[PDB]
Amino acid sequence: QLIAGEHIPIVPVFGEWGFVEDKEVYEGVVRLTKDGQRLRNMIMSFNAD
Amino acid sequence: MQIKTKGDLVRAALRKLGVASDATLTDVEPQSMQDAVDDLEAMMAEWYQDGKGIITGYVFSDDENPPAEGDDHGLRSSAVSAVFHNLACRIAPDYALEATAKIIATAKYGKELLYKQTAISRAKRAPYPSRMPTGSGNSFANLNEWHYFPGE
């Protein structure tokens, strides 16, 4: 089914975007905080126990 | 090794105690053999707490065999000295004697050496707790979504 326009009607928005080895990588702001946050939650749980 | 049977262990224990050996002119008496064999079986069964105690490879005689004396003990060569020294210490009070200080020290040393390897084997570290992260450095686990350790 032919649709109107010259371009694909989907518009993407990226954060930290690039290619490492012909492989796309996009990152937000939460990827690198995960380890610290999980460690903090684990330590607090241990302290409550 | 020359010591291969429970009778050999009992003879060694009695010789160390001085009760009956060729160092003296005394010969081992059958009633002194049977009682010490029973004592040795009881002591080995106490040591080997159904696998949770000292491991020696000792073969426990079953009731089907009439003479317990004469069967091979099955101990390794490195356990015979400890076993028969401790047997001499244990059966010394039968004759209202007292084992000498060297015999007592050798018994202690032999028991410690008996348990040394099993202690090294059993000194094992527990696995990771069920509430640890696996870390993002482990790319395989991170992609598989193995974000936490199993536990137990």
Short mmCIF file of all heavy atoms in Angstrom, two decimals, chain B residues 46-74:
data_model
loop_
_atom_site.label_atom_id
_atom_site.label_comp_id
_atom_site.label_asym_id
_atom_site.label_seq_id
_atom_site.Cartn_x
_atom_site.Cartn_y
_atom_site.Cartn_z
N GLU B 46 33.03 -44.67 66.70
CA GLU B 46 32.87 -43.34 67.29
C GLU B 46 33.55 -42.27 66.45
O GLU B 46 32.98 -41.21 66.21
CB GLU B 46 33.43 -43.32 68.72
CG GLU B 46 33.84 -41.95 69.20
CD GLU B 46 33.79 -41.82 70.71
OE1 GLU B 46 32.71 -42.05 71.29
OE2 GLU B 46 34.84 -41.49 71.31
N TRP B 47 34.78 -42.54 66.00
CA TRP B 47 35.49 -41.58 65.16
C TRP B 47 34.72 -41.30 63.88
O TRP B 47 34.46 -40.15 63.53
CB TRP B 47 36.89 -42.11 64.83
CG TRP B 47 37.86 -42.05 65.96
CD1 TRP B 47 37.59 -41.76 67.26
CD2 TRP B 47 39.27 -42.29 65.89
NE1 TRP B 47 38.74 -41.81 68.01
CE2 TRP B 47 39.79 -42.13 67.18
CE3 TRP B 47 40.14 -42.63 64.85
CZ2 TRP B 47 41.14 -42.29 67.47
CZ3 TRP B 47 41.48 -42.79 65.14
CH2 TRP B 47 41.97 -42.62 66.44
N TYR B 48 34.34 -42.36 63.16
CA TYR B 48 33.62 -42.24 61.90
C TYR B 48 32.14 -42.09 62.23
O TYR B 48 31.38 -43.06 62.26
CB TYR B 48 33.88 -43.47 61.03
CG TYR B 48 33.14 -43.53 59.72
CD1 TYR B 48 33.55 -42.77 58.64
CD2 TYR B 48 32.05 -44.37 59.56
CE1 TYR B 48 32.88 -42.83 57.43
CE2 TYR B 48 31.37 -44.44 58.36
CZ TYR B 48 31.79 -43.67 57.30
OH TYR B 48 31.12 -43.73 56.10
N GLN B 49 31.72 -40.85 62.47
CA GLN B 49 30.34 -40.58 62.85
C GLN B 49 29.43 -40.69 61.63
O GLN B 49 28.81 -39.70 61.22
CB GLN B 49 30.21 -39.20 63.49
CG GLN B 49 30.85 -39.08 64.85
CD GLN B 49 29.89 -39.36 65.98
OE1 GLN B 49 28.74 -38.93 65.95
NE2 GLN B 49 30.35 -40.09 66.99
N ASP B 50 29.33 -41.89 61.06
CA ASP B 50 28.53 -42.14 59.87
C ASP B 50 28.89 -41.18 58.74
O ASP B 50 28.03 -40.68 58.01
CB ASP B 50 27.03 -42.07 60.18
CG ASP B 50 26.55 -43.27 60.98
OD1 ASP B 50 27.05 -44.38 60.73
OD2 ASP B 50 25.68 -43.09 61.85
N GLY B 51 30.19 -40.93 58.58
CA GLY B 51 30.70 -40.12 57.50
C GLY B 51 30.92 -38.66 57.83
O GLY B 51 31.57 -37.96 57.05
N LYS B 52 30.40 -38.18 58.96
CA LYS B 52 30.57 -36.79 59.35
C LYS B 52 31.77 -36.57 60.25
O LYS B 52 32.00 -35.44 60.69
CB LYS B 52 29.30 -36.28 60.05
CG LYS B 52 28.01 -36.73 59.38
CD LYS B 52 27.39 -35.59 58.58
CE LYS B 52 25.90 -35.80 58.40
NZ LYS B 52 25.27 -34.69 57.64
N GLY B 53 32.55 -37.62 60.53
CA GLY B 53 33.71 -37.49 61.38
C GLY B 53 35.02 -37.77 60.66
O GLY B 53 35.23 -37.30 59.54
N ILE B 54 35.89 -38.54 61.30
CA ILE B 54 37.20 -38.84 60.73
C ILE B 54 37.06 -39.93 59.69
O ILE B 54 36.48 -40.99 59.95
CB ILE B 54 38.19 -39.25 61.84
CG1 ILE B 54 38.36 -38.12 62.85
CG2 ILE B 54 39.52 -39.65 61.24
CD1 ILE B 54 39.43 -38.38 63.88
N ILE B 55 37.59 -39.68 58.49
CA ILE B 55 37.57 -40.65 57.41
C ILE B 55 38.90 -41.39 57.39
O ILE B 55 39.97 -40.78 57.39
CB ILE B 55 37.30 -39.96 56.06
CG1 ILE B 55 35.80 -39.89 55.78
CG2 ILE B 55 38.00 -40.69 54.92
CD1 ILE B 55 35.06 -38.88 56.63
N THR B 56 38.83 -42.73 57.40
CA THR B 56 40.02 -43.56 57.45
C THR B 56 40.02 -44.71 56.47
O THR B 56 41.08 -45.31 56.25
CB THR B 56 40.22 -44.13 58.86
OG1 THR B 56 38.95 -44.51 59.41
CG2 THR B 56 40.86 -43.10 59.77
N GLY B 57 38.88 -45.05 55.86
CA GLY B 57 38.80 -46.24 55.05
C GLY B 57 38.68 -47.52 55.84
O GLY B 57 38.75 -48.60 55.26
N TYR B 58 38.52 -47.42 57.16
CA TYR B 58 38.36 -48.60 58.00
C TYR B 58 37.14 -49.40 57.57
O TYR B 58 36.07 -48.84 57.30
CB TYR B 58 38.22 -48.17 59.46
CG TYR B 58 38.34 -49.29 60.47
CD1 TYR B 58 39.57 -49.84 60.78
CD2 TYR B 58 37.21 -49.78 61.12
CE1 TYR B 58 39.67 -50.86 61.71
CE2 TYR B 58 37.31 -50.79 62.04
CZ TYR B 58 38.54 -51.33 62.33
OH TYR B 58 38.64 -52.34 63.26
N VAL B 59 37.30 -50.72 57.50
CA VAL B 59 36.23 -51.62 57.09
C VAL B 59 35.55 -52.15 58.34
O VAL B 59 36.19 -52.79 59.18
CB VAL B 59 36.77 -52.77 56.22
CG1 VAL B 59 35.62 -53.47 55.52
CG2 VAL B 59 37.78 -52.25 55.22
N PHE B 60 34.26 -51.88 58.47
CA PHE B 60 33.49 -52.30 59.63
C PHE B 60 32.97 -53.72 59.40
O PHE B 60 32.22 -53.96 58.45
CB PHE B 60 32.34 -51.34 59.89
CG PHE B 60 32.78 -49.99 60.38
CD1 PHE B 60 32.73 -48.89 59.54
CD2 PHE B 60 33.25 -49.82 61.66
CE1 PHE B 60 33.13 -47.65 59.98
CE2 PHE B 60 33.66 -48.59 62.11
CZ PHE B 60 33.61 -47.50 61.26
N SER B 61 33.39 -54.64 60.26
CA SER B 61 32.96 -56.03 60.13
C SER B 61 31.47 -56.15 60.40
O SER B 61 30.93 -55.52 61.32
CB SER B 61 33.75 -56.91 61.09
OG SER B 61 33.89 -56.29 62.36
N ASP B 62 30.80 -56.96 59.59
CA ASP B 62 29.38 -57.24 59.78
C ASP B 62 29.21 -58.49 60.63
O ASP B 62 30.12 -59.30 60.79
CB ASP B 62 28.68 -57.41 58.43
CG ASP B 62 29.56 -58.11 57.41
OD1 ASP B 62 30.36 -58.98 57.80
OD2 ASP B 62 29.44 -57.79 56.21
N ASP B 63 28.00 -58.64 61.19
CA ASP B 63 27.73 -59.74 62.11
C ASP B 63 27.85 -61.10 61.44
O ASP B 63 28.02 -62.11 62.13
CB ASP B 63 26.34 -59.58 62.72
CG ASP B 63 25.23 -59.84 61.71
OD1 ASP B 63 25.04 -58.99 60.81
OD2 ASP B 63 24.55 -60.88 61.83
N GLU B 64 27.76 -61.16 60.10
CA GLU B 64 27.78 -62.44 59.42
C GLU B 64 29.11 -63.15 59.59
O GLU B 64 29.16 -64.39 59.64
CB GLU B 64 27.45 -62.25 57.94
CG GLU B 64 27.03 -63.53 57.23
CD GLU B 64 28.06 -64.01 56.22
OE1 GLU B 64 28.42 -63.22 55.31
OE2 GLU B 64 28.52 -65.16 56.33
N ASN B 65 30.20 -62.40 59.66
CA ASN B 65 31.51 -63.00 59.86
C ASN B 65 31.72 -63.30 61.34
O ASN B 65 31.71 -62.37 62.16
CB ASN B 65 32.61 -62.08 59.35
CG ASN B 65 33.91 -62.83 59.06
OD1 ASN B 65 34.92 -62.61 59.72
ND2 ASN B 65 33.87 -63.71 58.07
N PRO B 66 31.90 -64.56 61.73
CA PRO B 66 32.03 -64.89 63.16
C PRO B 66 33.27 -64.27 63.79
O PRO B 66 33.15 -63.55 64.79
CB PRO B 66 32.08 -66.43 63.17
CG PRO B 66 31.40 -66.82 61.89
CD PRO B 66 31.74 -65.76 60.89
N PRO B 67 34.50 -64.52 63.26
CA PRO B 67 35.66 -63.89 63.89
C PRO B 67 35.94 -62.50 63.34
O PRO B 67 36.29 -62.36 62.16
CB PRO B 67 36.81 -64.86 63.57
CG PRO B 67 36.31 -65.71 62.41
CD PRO B 67 34.93 -65.25 62.05
N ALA B 68 35.80 -61.47 64.17
CA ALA B 68 36.22 -60.14 63.76
C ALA B 68 37.73 -60.07 63.62
O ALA B 68 38.25 -59.40 62.72
CB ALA B 68 35.72 -59.09 64.75
N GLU B 69 38.45 -60.76 64.50
CA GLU B 69 39.89 -60.87 64.39
C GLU B 69 40.27 -61.55 63.08
O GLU B 69 39.66 -62.55 62.68
CB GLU B 69 40.43 -61.66 65.59
CG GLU B 69 41.62 -62.62 65.37
CD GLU B 69 42.87 -61.98 64.78
OE1 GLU B 69 42.86 -60.77 64.48
OE2 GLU B 69 43.87 -62.70 64.63
N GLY B 70 41.29 -61.01 62.42
CA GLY B 70 41.82 -61.56 61.20
C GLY B 70 41.42 -60.83 59.94
O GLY B 70 42.14 -60.92 58.93
N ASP B 71 40.31 -60.10 59.96
CA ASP B 71 39.90 -59.34 58.79
C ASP B 71 40.79 -58.11 58.62
O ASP B 71 41.25 -57.51 59.59
CB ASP B 71 38.44 -58.93 58.90
CG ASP B 71 37.49 -60.06 58.60
OD1 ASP B 71 37.65 -60.71 57.54
OD2 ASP B 71 36.57 -60.31 59.41
N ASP B 72 41.02 -57.74 57.36
CA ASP B 72 41.82 -56.56 57.07
C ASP B 72 41.10 -55.30 57.52
O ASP B 72 39.89 -55.15 57.30
CB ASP B 72 42.14 -56.49 55.58
CG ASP B 72 42.79 -57.75 55.06
OD1 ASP B 72 43.03 -58.67 55.87
OD2 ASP B 72 43.07 -57.82 53.85
N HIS B 73 41.84 -54.39 58.16
CA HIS B 73 41.23 -53.15 58.63
C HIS B 73 40.90 -52.21 57.47
O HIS B 73 39.93 -51.45 57.56
CB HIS B 73 42.14 -52.46 59.63
CG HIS B 73 43.59 -52.47 59.25
ND1 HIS B 73 44.05 -51.94 58.06
CD2 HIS B 73 44.68 -52.94 59.90
CE1 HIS B 73 45.36 -52.08 58.00
NE2 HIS B 73 45.76 -52.69 59.10
N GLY B 74 41.68 -52.26 56.40
CA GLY B 74 41.45 -51.39 55.26
C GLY B 74 42.02 -50.00 55.38
O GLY B 74 41.82 -49.19 54.47
#
